[PDB]
Every structure is written in structure tokens, then in C-alpha cells.
Enzyme design. Structure first.
Site, PDB file in Angstrom:
ATOM      1  N   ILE A   1     -26.218  -1.734 -26.221  1.00  0.00           N
ATOM      2  CA  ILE A   1     -27.786  -1.533 -26.796  1.00  0.00           C
ATOM      3  C   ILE A   1     -28.869  -2.050 -25.931  1.00  0.00           C
ATOM      4  O   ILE A   1     -29.944  -1.486 -25.944  1.00  0.00           O
ATOM      5  CB  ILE A   1     -27.837  -2.674 -28.097  1.00  0.00           C
ATOM      6  N   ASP A   2     -28.668  -2.859 -24.865  1.00  0.00           N
ATOM      7  CA  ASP A   2     -29.672  -3.237 -23.708  1.00  0.00           C
ATOM      8  C   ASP A   2     -29.003  -4.015 -22.759  1.00  0.00           C
ATOM      9  O   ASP A   2     -27.926  -4.329 -22.829  1.00  0.00           O
ATOM     10  CB  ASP A   2     -30.938  -4.061 -24.420  1.00  0.00           C
ATOM     11  N   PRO A   3     -29.738  -4.117 -21.671  1.00  0.00           N
ATOM     12  CA  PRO A   3     -29.189  -4.961 -20.304  1.00  0.00           C
ATOM     13  C   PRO A   3     -28.656  -6.459 -20.524  1.00  0.00           C
ATOM     14  O   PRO A   3     -29.017  -7.221 -21.756  1.00  0.00           O
ATOM     15  CB  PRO A   3     -30.300  -4.887 -19.247  1.00  0.00           C
TER      16      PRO A   3
ATOM     17  N   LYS B   1     -32.222  -7.762 -27.103  1.00  0.00           N
ATOM     18  CA  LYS B   1     -33.198  -6.743 -28.060  1.00  0.00           C
ATOM     19  C   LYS B   1     -34.769  -7.272 -28.016  1.00  0.00           C
ATOM     20  O   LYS B   1     -35.188  -7.092 -28.784  1.00  0.00           O
ATOM     21  CB  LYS B   1     -32.576  -7.040 -29.251  1.00  0.00           C
TER      22      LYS B   1
END
Ligand SMILES: [Cl-]
Ligand SMILES: [Cl-]
Ligand SMILES: [K+]
Lengths: 221, 220
Positions: B69-71, B133
Site C-alpha cells: 500500500i505504501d513505503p 497511509k
């Protein structure tokens, strides 16, 4: 569950009989069908109007796979998607041939996608002008979206036949259903012959902790 | 070289990208110029110079996208999942699954970005340090644009995290076959028994594609 329900529409076929599982969309379906039927019915159709909606008698809540084609056979549509009682239609013969190679069933006289546990076969548009593939897309447009959306709230896997036919439809469908958009049974360079989408369906089902489809149930002997 | 470039109004100022991304870059530049200020006021993972380094990868030779979903909340490198010193839970749990799948027992690390046919992806391209997020609102349109482009090339999208991706995968404007599995860094140990990595090569070979050699990811 075992008793069908009915609604009235203004034009042929005048009554739509349907299984309980379809109740949530019927009011909308009636509204939309009343809007276009007059135009639609000016053409000879496959199937005949009395057969347009017979697949709405099939239960949905016990289905885990939808096998979807774009519209009925250009002639001799029965109202059951893919069904060919004389086993002459290219699509169902090519499908049967893939399943034959998959299952080891070599000797058979026909095949029917509508007698397989967990599978609902589907025609995205519910008619065409007799002899003219995709000719009634303009009429079924809103109804077709309504119905497919409903189906994919129930099935886990949607298998669509024809990349040009379905890539956009499948892409724009907002749903958790797992999509496979494969070659159509009559694709050039015999691409459907090397297609193993029926096996892919079973892999995806089993990954999702669901029973595989027994494709050999479709055979007629 | 197959490399192209565009300029943007804030850091990182220029983006160099492989030809395969050309169709989305005009739109990307427009979006980024709107939101860059929000992304730059914070300390970010990764740093702005690393936001777009994955756009250097070709797409025509890719057949699987592995998507988080993200780093990482800290130490992001711009390469999704990458941990240079092998200290992040996600990539360590991934390596252990690949170890079980391949039988490779001894290793010092793992990197999804050195495997032929695989593109590792972060849906959002940054986060505010220490908060997952935390930049979703700013990446939103760019994230949709880029993932849609990726799925025109790959034949399998493998998303990690059922809560993270149920809705994103449902709304994704692509016909691509998508697998949404458990997250590797979850406390509940369900990823340990997840057969998603194993099934990818099954799917690829059934689709007449070459399999992924997951052992290419190991660092020794
Ligand atoms: Cl096709
Ligand atoms: Cl999860
Ligand atoms: K979907």
C-alpha cells in the site's frame, strides 16, 4: 426458494418469471425494459422474446463462477447462454474440446454449461437481431450493467470470453469478483485452443478456499 | 537508452522514466505540481528524490506486479519492500515464504526488485515519517493512474493486505487477474500459510507465460 415469482412488463414477453435471488434488481429491470422494448421488439431476435429472461430462473446464491459471453448465438438461441441442443455452435464445440482435453472425457455427444454445479453461464446482452452479433447492445446497455453487477455480488470468479468484447466492460465493473478475460472460441491464429481458463478458474477458487468446478458435469452422452 | 524526462515545479524537479511509462507522464506531472508542497513540508519515506525511481523500470518485460500500500514508515529507498540491511518485517516474512517455496535455506537478504518479470510496487509513493497511509489523500489520483498503467502490462496483480486493497482492487479500472493476499507484516501469522506466492507461477504457466524465478531475489 423452489417457487418462482412474477412481474408484469408492458411489452412482450409481458411476464418475467424469476428466482428469489434476483428480487433486488427486478423493479429496476422492469423500468428499464419498459423503456426500450418497443424499439427492440421491431427486430426478429435470438432468442425469441418469450425466452429473453429464462436464465433469471437460475439460483445465484449457490454459484461461484460466471462464464460470460457477449450476447446470444446469432441464430437458434434458447435463452440459456451457450446452449446448443444439436451441438452445432462453434463456441460450445470449442469449449467442449478444451474440457475434453482437460478432463480426459474423449467420447461425448454434446456439452452444456448450464448443468454444472456452481456455474452460471451468462449472455451480457440478452438478445441480438436474428443473424447479427452485438446488434442489440444499444437496447440492453443499462439492463446488462444492472444484471452483471448483481451476479458478481455472488460469484467469486467471472470468466469473460473475448478480449475486445469484454476488456472495457470488465475494467469498468466495480466489484470484488476475480476477473479473467480470455480469447473468444473463434479467435484468429487458433488462440482459444491454447487457452486454459477453465483450469485457471479452479486454481483461483482453490486459492480462495472454495471447491473447484467439475467441468466434466457439462458433458452430454 | 529508452529514457525520457519531464520537469515538475518542486523537488525532485525532474523525473527520468522508461519509455513504457510515456502515456501517463503528462497527467502525472499535472497532478504532482498540485500536491508537491504537501509532500515536501514533512520528513518523508522515501525522500522526494526517490519518489519516482521505479518509473525507470521497463514494463513490457513484466508479468507480475507485487503491490504493497505504501513505503515503510521509515528508511524507504524508493524501491518497494527494499531493506538494504534486511531489518524490515515485511521483506523478512516475504523472504521466509520464498525460502519455503524454493528450498533456499541460507541467505542474508531478499529484494523483489532484482527478479526478472516482477515489478514491486507501492500504491502510494510516500508517507509522513512514522505514519502508514499518511499521504493517501495526496497520491490518490497519481496512484490510480500508475497502477492502471501497470496492469495493462502484467498478467497477475498480487496485492498484499486484504483491508488495504479490497476496495482499491474492486475499483481498479483493469480487467487484470488480481490476487489479494494477507499482509506479511501482520501479527496474526496468516501470511505464513498463504499460498499466493506459490500460485503465481501456476497461473503464469497456465496462461502460457514464463514462470518467475523467485530465488533471484535472494542476497547472499
Ligand atoms: Cl479475443
Ligand atoms: Cl490482510
Ligand atoms: K474485480
Amino acid at each position: 426458494g423452489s417457487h418462482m415469482n412474477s412481474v408484469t412488463v408492458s411489452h412482450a414477453p409481458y411476464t418475467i418469471t424469476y428466482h428469489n435471488d434476483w428480487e433486488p434488481v427486478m423493479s429496476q429491470l422492469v423500468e428499464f425494459y419498459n423503456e426500450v422494448a418497443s424499439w427492440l421488439l421491431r427486430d426478429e431476435t435470438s432468442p425469441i422474446p418469450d425466452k429473453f429472461f429464462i436464465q433469471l430462473k437460475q439460483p445465484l446464491r449457490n454459484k461461484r463462477v460466471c462464464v460470460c459471453g457477449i450476447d446470444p448465438y446469432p441464430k437458434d438461441g434458447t435463452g440459456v447462454p451457450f446452449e446448443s441442443p444439436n451441438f452445432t455452435k462453434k463456441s460450445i464445440k470449442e469449449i467442449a474440446s478444451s474440457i475434453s482435453r482437460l478432463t480426459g472425457v474423449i467420447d461425448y455427444k454434446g456439452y452444456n454449461l448450464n448443468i454444472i454445479d456452481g456455474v452460471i453461464p451468462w449472455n451480457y446482452y440478452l438478445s441480438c437481431k436474428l443473424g447479427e452479433t452485438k446488434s442489440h447492445a444499444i437496447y440492453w446497455d443499462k439492463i446488462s450493467k444492472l444484471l452483471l453487477q448483481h451476479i458478481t455480488k455472488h460469484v467469486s470468479v467471472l470468466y469473460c470470453l473475448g478480449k475486445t468484447d469484454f476488456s472495457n466492460i470488465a475494467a469498468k465493473l466495480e466489484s470484488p469478483v476475480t476477473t479473467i478475460v480470455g480469447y473468444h472460441p473463434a479467435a484468429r491464429d487458433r488462440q482459444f485452443e491454447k487457452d486454459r481458463s477453465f483450469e485457471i478458474i479452479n486454481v483461483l477458487l482453490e486459492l480462495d478456499n472454495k471447491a473447484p468446478i467439475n467441468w466434466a458435469q457439462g458433458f452430454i452422452y
